[PDB]
Amino acid sequence: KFNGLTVLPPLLTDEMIAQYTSALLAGTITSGWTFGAGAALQIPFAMQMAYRFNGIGVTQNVLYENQKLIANQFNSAIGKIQDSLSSTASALGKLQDVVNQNAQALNTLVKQLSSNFGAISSVLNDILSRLDKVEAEVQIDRLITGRLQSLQTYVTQQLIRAAEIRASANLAATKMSECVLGQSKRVDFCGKGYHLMSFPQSAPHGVVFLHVTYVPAQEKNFTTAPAICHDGKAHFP
Amino acid sequence: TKCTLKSFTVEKGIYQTSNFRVQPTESIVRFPNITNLCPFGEVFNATRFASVYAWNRKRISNCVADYSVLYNSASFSTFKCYGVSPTKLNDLCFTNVYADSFVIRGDEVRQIAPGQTGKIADYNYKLPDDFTGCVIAWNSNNLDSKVGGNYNYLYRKPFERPLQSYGFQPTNGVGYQPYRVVVLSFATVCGPKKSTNLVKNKCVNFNFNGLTGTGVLTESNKKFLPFQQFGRDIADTTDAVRDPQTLEILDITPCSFGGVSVITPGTNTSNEVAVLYQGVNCTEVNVFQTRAGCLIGAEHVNNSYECDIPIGAGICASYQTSQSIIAYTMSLGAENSVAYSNNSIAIPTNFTISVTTEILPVSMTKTSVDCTMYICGDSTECSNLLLQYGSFCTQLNRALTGIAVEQDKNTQEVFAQVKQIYKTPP
Amino acid sequence: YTMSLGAENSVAYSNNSIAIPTNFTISVTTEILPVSMTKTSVDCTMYICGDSTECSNLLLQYGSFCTQLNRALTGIAVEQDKNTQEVFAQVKQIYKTPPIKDFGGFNFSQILPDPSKSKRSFIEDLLFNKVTNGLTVLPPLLTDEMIAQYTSALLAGTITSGWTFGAGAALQIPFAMQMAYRFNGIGVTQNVLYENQKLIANQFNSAIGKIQDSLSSTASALGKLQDVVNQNAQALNTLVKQLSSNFGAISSVLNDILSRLDKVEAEVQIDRLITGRLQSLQTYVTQQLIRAAEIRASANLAATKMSECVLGQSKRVD
Amino acid sequence: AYTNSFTRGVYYPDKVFRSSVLHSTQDLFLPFFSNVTWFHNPVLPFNDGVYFASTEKSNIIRGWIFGTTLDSKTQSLLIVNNATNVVIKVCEFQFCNDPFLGVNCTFEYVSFKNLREFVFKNIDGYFKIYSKHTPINLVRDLPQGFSALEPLVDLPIGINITRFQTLLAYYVGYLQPRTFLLKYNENGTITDAVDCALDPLSE
Numbered sequence A: 001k002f003n004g005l006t007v008l009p010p011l012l013t014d015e016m017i018a019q020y021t022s023a024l025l026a027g028t029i030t031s032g033w034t035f036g037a038g039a040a041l042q043i044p045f046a047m048q049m050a051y052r053f054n055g056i057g058v059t060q061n062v063l064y065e066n067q068k069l070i071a072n073q074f075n076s077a078i079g080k081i082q083d084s085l086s087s088t089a090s091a092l093g094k095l096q097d098v099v100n101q102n103a104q105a106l107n108t109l110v111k112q113l114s115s116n117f118g119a120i121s122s123v124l125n126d127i128l129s130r131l132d133k134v135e136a137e138v139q140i141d142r143l144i145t146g147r148l149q150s151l152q153t154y155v156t157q158q159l160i161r162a163a164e165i166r167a168s169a170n171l172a173a174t175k176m177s178e179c180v181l182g183q184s185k186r187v188d189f190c191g192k193g194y195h196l197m198s199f200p201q202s203a204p205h206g207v208v209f210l211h212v213t214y215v216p217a218q219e220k221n222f223t224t225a226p227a228i229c230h231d232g233k234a235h236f237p
Numbered sequence B: 001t002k003c004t005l006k007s008f009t010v011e012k013g014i015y016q017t018s019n020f021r022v023q024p025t026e027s028i029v030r031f032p033n034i035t036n037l038c039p040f041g042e043v044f045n046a047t048r049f050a051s052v053y054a055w056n057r058k059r060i061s062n063c064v065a066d067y068s069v070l071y072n073s074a075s076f077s078t079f080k081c082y083g084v085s086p087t088k089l090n091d092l093c094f095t096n097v098y099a100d101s102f103v104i105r106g107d108e109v110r111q112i113a114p115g116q117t118g119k120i121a122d123y124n125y126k127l128p129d130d131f132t133g134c135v136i137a138w139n140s141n142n143l144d145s146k147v148g149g150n151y152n153y154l155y156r157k158p159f160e161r162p163l164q165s166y167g168f169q170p171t172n173g174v175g176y177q178p179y180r181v182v183v184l185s186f187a188t189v190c191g192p193k194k195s196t197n198l199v200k201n202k203c204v205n206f207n208f209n210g211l212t213g214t215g216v217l218t219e220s221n222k223k224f225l226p227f228q229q230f231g232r233d234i235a236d237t238t239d240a241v242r243d244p245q246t247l248e249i250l251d252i253t254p255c256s257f258g259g260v261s262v263i264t265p266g267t268n269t270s271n272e273v274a275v276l277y278q279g280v281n282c283t284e285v286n287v288f289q290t291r292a293g294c295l296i297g298a299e300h301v302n303n304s305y306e307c308d309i310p311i312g313a314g315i316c317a318s319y320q321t322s323q324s325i326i327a328y329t330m331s332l333g334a335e336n337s338v339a340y341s342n343n344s345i346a347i348p349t350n351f352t353i354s355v356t357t358e359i360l361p362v363s364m365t366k367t368s369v370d371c372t373m374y375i376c377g378d379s380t381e382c383s384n385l386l387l388q389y390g391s392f393c394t395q396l397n398r399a400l401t402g403i404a405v406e407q408d409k410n411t412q413e414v415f416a417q418v419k420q421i422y423k424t425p426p
Numbered sequence C: 001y002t003m004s005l006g007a008e009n010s011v012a013y014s015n016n017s018i019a020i021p022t023n024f025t026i027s028v029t030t031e032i033l034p035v036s037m038t039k040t041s042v043d044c045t046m047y048i049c050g051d052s053t054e055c056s057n058l059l060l061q062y063g064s065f066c067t068q069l070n071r072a073l074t075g076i077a078v079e080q081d082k083n084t085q086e087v088f089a090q091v092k093q094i095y096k097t098p099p100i101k102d103f104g105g106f107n108f109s110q111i112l113p114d115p116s117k118s119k120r121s122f123i124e125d126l127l128f129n130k131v132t133n134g135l136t137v138l139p140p141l142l143t144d145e146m147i148a149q150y151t152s153a154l155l156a157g158t159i160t161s162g163w164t165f166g167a168g169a170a171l172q173i174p175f176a177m178q179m180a181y182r183f184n185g186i187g188v189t190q191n192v193l194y195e196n197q198k199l200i201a202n203q204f205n206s207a208i209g210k211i212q213d214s215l216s217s218t219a220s221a222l223g224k225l226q227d228v229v230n231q232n233a234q235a236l237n238t239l240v241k242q243l244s245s246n247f248g249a250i251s252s253v254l255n256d257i258l259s260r261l262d263k264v265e266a267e268v269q270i271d272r273l274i275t276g277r278l279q280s281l282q283t284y285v286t287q288q289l290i291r292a293a294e295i296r297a298s299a300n301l302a303a304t305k306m307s308e309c310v311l312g313q314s315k316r317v318d
Numbered sequence D: 001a002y003t004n005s006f007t008r009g010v011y012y013p014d015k016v017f018r019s020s021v022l023h024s025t026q027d028l029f030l031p032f033f034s035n036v037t038w039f040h041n042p043v044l045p046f047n048d049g050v051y052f053a054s055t056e057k058s059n060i061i062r063g064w065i066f067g068t069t070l071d072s073k074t075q076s077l078l079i080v081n082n083a084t085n086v087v088i089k090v091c092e093f094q095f096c097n098d099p100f101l102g103v104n105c106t107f108e109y110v111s112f113k114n115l116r117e118f119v120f121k122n123i124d125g126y127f128k129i130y131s132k133h134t135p136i137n138l139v140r141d142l143p144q145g146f147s148a149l150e151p152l153v154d155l156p157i158g159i160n161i162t163r164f165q166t167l168l169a170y171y172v173g174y175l176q177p178r179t180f181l182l183k184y185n186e187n188g189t190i191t192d193a194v195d196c197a198l199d200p201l202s203e
């Protein structure tokens, strides 16, 4: 378990990440996107949402005339996230998978110490206690070659996995810059619906975004026209 | 599955556990219609024989030595070998060989064998004492004798010509009695190989003309040129053969094989499971021939649902209604005819604010392996050998150090996007 | 010759001169992206050892390799379905068009399905024509006849309901009114559409026609997909050809070690073939992991183009 | 005197069927566009192996001798074609330095209108014959066209052939170790070839 394998701590502790997710969130609540652009500028939270609705082509008065409904929907929806996360761990599959793959890689790297690779024993001290150096070196070359090939394989796996996790980190960094610090217009980049804002929350080895999105609900059919004739001239909306 | 995963609990999924492989039902052998067997009748039943003091010889090469049958047959009463097992005469061979031969009174006639007893053997009658191959002998009274001892029989180089006439006579005593022998001294001479019937359509182990394999053999339309014996796939693999006895061409195909995979709900729910034999036809192995292979232990269903456990080729499985494993063509989603026309629009009259979780990994566990301590358990004798492999340990530890530093950078690039620690009002 | 980078053009700039387009061309430009490899699995015991028990026993001394090589290829194989899922399964319902084709004079008939075709569009049928052991191949989870229902659904949503089926329920809207939104989305005022609607339809219908001719005239436009097939075939053929290599053993025909030598000599010789074949397999698996990481980068790009570029209207220039 | 081999002197390398496929092989082959000797006879070196070809209609060339001395000291392949028979024998023959006609002994065997073409090589104690017959519209030189020669005889003769002679126009070329790419058609015949060493396009 400890045969030259070691785990180093992160530079940032989880308590430091929790301060950064607090800072990002407190900026996002008190000051909208402005703390992303430069100095944080305070703005009342209803007026921030009024800008964010206007950012999806919904007129500001559609917020203010519905503010208690919108607050009740938002507060209720946050409550449903706690229930969803409480109900099953299987929601965090993307994080638990990254922990499990590393544990399987190290357990495979450790179990490979027990393999003979065609030597008389995989316990190196057997060879050294049982054989003269001229004989022992022919056996130990097999264990060295086998163990070295196993270690090169483990490092090759970890390089490829580290590139996959870098692509995920660059995606998360892009998500935070646009989707928390701004209001990304990029359809379905910030969850389903028209994007409003998102709140980051820290997680072991990762990040969780709560994307908040306007989704249209009840709807009606109408007869429609591209334009209307008045005094022979055509009017457009 | 529990053993494959090294666990007593198995979560819902599909797991590969083993490889299924149709077994060879028997071994076929094919070689051409047998020909050019060695003329051992011309050795042992010869019309005349030289003296043991003057042993003759004849060719025993480029012809197939069926000598195991000849050694048990009436051509010899006794046999021996100078450099081989006597039972090997069914299949033994040399690049060249010859049958040295002679007859005499039995004490001298015994010299007609490789390195045989009495000085007349090394002086004339025998093959050399170091010579490879075997010899045989029998009573010579049918021709190699005369009433007072035959003067054509005699005793004293090996297989060559100081000498006198032998006692070989029909009235002779046990040491004087007429005897004759030959030494078949030592690819071309080879003993005959057997062959089987050519069983088609079964999975069979096989030999043709000294190539071998395991596969299914079937009649084919492929037009080999007459000297061609074997057919090849694009990448080295044998795909057809000529039968050496019946010059038609048969295909080869590998005996059917594939991953045994276990469909299961969680063991924290049920011990019922279903097995997918990937790729195989159900004829080879409550049974359902999917496009992914034969499935066993699952019920085919005409409904369709979201894909719970995937199989392949549009098939999925789940544990459902009192309940059992079902397999079904997956539903892509409920269909919907959109109410389009040149003048109809739908407009929403109300909204829902959704909140949707999204989750992304950012760091691996920062890990470092001291490659010298991993490869060598503190042994200096091991470390001194590891130096012969040069830079590899330094290189591997450098590569893992690059990964380890990058996890801090990933965490920095995600979270350190804000220059100040903002705090809320109370 | 020393190549030229392009035609030289001095822009006629001055502090009071502007150029404004009096007209436009609608254009249709193809873009092609790989999304999945051929899902592949290898029985390393059958690959390394040709059903020989002596070889199969020797291989046990190497421990975990045949397990972790199966696991590595299985991880890649599952990821191919995940890529295909995230590209195509972006829509909650299989939308379908009405029987009528009152799309304001636009003509999608070449890109919509034909039920007489597997149910695919005519342009999808061009594309399906222009692309062409111990080792095994596994089928994709979604068949070509399933993917064609998702491309039909995404397309029928896009035609009938604008981007709205990406944001929520598919709200129907007439196609000449959807294009007025698309024009306002590029800052061209919507009356430019209506005052040019027949011209815009003619340019669009003509441009769709030219895609068929472009795809029919040369395979070189479709090279990315053909190359992904070529690379996997070339990798598997290399892995098969390596079975014939001797690696310093007396012959790569495994039975012609066993039938020829004494057991100690045969085991020392077979350990070469095991080492060589196992190193050849580790090489192939490493190639497939790196190739699969490239295809995953292409699939995440394609999935993003599906979300922004089909389901929406991206302002991301080029 | 000399002429040129052009496209000729390919032969089936092994007893194997391959079809609708391109295959790479390395062997003693007649190099493409190599110069070849010309004759209407002398005694010649075998080199690594021989390409031999003669315009024929009446068996004017009676056969060949292959060996080292071609006289008494060591075994030699007398090869003769005599009407209904092909006949071979292996003696250290006591015949003249060049046996002719007008208008040890360890083995023996029995089996212009045209060009007759042949290849001979002696490897690992085995002697090989490959051959082809074709009708023709040219008899002054080997025509630029393609037809792979196919095996007739394959025997473990064990003799070290280094020299040969014709028995009595014809041409002599010599094989060299080269890599060739062979076009096997749908019917399992070789139908075209490339020698990788001929030019950079061939590489």
Ligand SMILES: *[C@@H]1O[C@H](CO)[C@@H](O[C@@H]2O[C@H](CO)[C@@H](O)[C@H](O)[C@H]2NC(C)=O)[C@H](O)[C@H]1NC(C)=O
Binding pocket: C022, C023, C024, C025, C199, C202, C203
């Ligand atoms: C804008 O450009 C279009 C072509 O893109 C012009 O349409 C063509 O006009 C000519 C006559 O000038 C017709 O013969 C062609 O058949 C038209 N082409 C198509 C595809 O319809 C159009 O006239 C231009 N409009 C303006 C205002 O300049």
Ligand SMILES: *[C@@H]1O[C@H](CO)[C@@H](O[C@@H]2O[C@H](CO)[C@@H](O)[C@H](O)[C@H]2NC(C)=O)[C@H](O)[C@H]1NC(C)=O
Binding pocket: C101, C107, C109, C110, C209
């Ligand atoms: C849409 O365009 C297609 C061609 O892109 C038109 O199909 C052709 O129509 C003519 C007249 O009916 C036929 O002669 C051709 O054989 C058709 N070709 C094919 C491939 O079907 C189609 O008519 C157009 N439809 C609409 C509604 O405009």
Ligand SMILES: *[C@@H]1O[C@H](CO)[C@@H](O)[C@H](O)[C@H]1NC(C)=O
Binding pocket: A219, A220, A221, B339, B346
């Ligand atoms: C719109 O009208 C059509 C019939 O014209 C009907 O099928 C559809 O369900 C209606 N949709 C709504 C939201 O009322």
Ligand SMILES: *[C@@H]1O[C@H](CO)[C@@H](O)[C@H](O)[C@H]1NC(C)=O
Binding pocket: B033, B244, B245, B246, B247
């Ligand atoms: C082999 O012998 C059988 C009869 O015993 C005959 O039918 C078959 O054609 C022969 N094959 C050859 C290649 O001579």
Ligand SMILES: *[C@@H]1O[C@H](CO)[C@@H](O)[C@H](O)[C@H]1NC(C)=O
Binding pocket: B268, B269
């Ligand atoms: C697992 O099984 C236990 C009983 O053995 C049960 O209490 C528990 O709810 C089960 N969990 C799930 C997720 O099914």
Ligand SMILES: *[C@@H]1O[C@H](CO)[C@@H](O)[C@H](O)[C@H]1NC(C)=O
Binding pocket: B281, B282, B283, B289
């Ligand atoms: C192979 O499977 C198909 C169905 O996939 C079946 O029709 C066929 O009969 C099977 N072949 C054999 C030899 O059983």
Ligand SMILES: *[C@@H]1O[C@H](CO)[C@@H](O)[C@H](O)[C@H]1NC(C)=O
Binding pocket: B300, B301, B302
């Ligand atoms: C599926 O439904 C059809 C009728 O639509 C029926 O004939 C068939 O028997 C059903 N399948 C099974 C496995 O029973």
Ligand SMILES: *[C@@H]1O[C@H](CO)[C@@H](O)[C@H](O)[C@H]1NC(C)=O
Binding pocket: A218, B349, B350, B351, B352
């Ligand atoms: C809008 O939806 C909410 C529930 O989400 C409902 O309480 C409210 O009455 C609805 N308002 C209208 C005008 O339909």
Ligand SMILES: *[C@@H]1O[C@H](CO)[C@@H](O)[C@H](O)[C@H]1NC(C)=O
Binding pocket: D002, D003, D035, D036
């Ligand atoms: C050899 O070939 C060249 C052309 O490649 C030709 O010019 C030359 O005359 C030939 N020489 C002989 C000796 O045949």
Ligand SMILES: *[C@@H]1O[C@H](CO)[C@@H](O)[C@H](O)[C@H]1NC(C)=O
Binding pocket: D082, D083, D084, D085, D087
């Ligand atoms: C060919 O020559 C051999 C002797 O070398 C002779 O036995 C045979 O009869 C001849 N055949 C013909 C057809 O002349």
Ligand SMILES: *[C@@H]1O[C@H](CO)[C@@H](O)[C@H](O)[C@H]1NC(C)=O
Binding pocket: D072, D091, D092, D093, D094, D104, D105
């Ligand atoms: C073959 O060798 C024998 C002596 O072993 C000799 O008598 C005979 O003349 C040789 N053959 C020829 C063709 O000379």
Ligand SMILES: *[C@@H]1O[C@H](CO)[C@@H](O)[C@H](O)[C@H]1NC(C)=O
Binding pocket: D158, D159, D160
């Ligand atoms: C043939 O040549 C080899 C060396 O190349 C030699 O060992 C062998 O004895 C020779 N055989 C004869 C029959 O001359």
Ligand SMILES: *[C@@H]1O[C@H](CO)[C@@H](O)[C@H](O)[C@H]1NC(C)=O
Binding pocket: D185, D186, D187
């Ligand atoms: C293959 O052989 C058949 C006759 O067996 C002939 O009809 C056909 O034309 C040949 N095809 C090729 C490509 O040589």
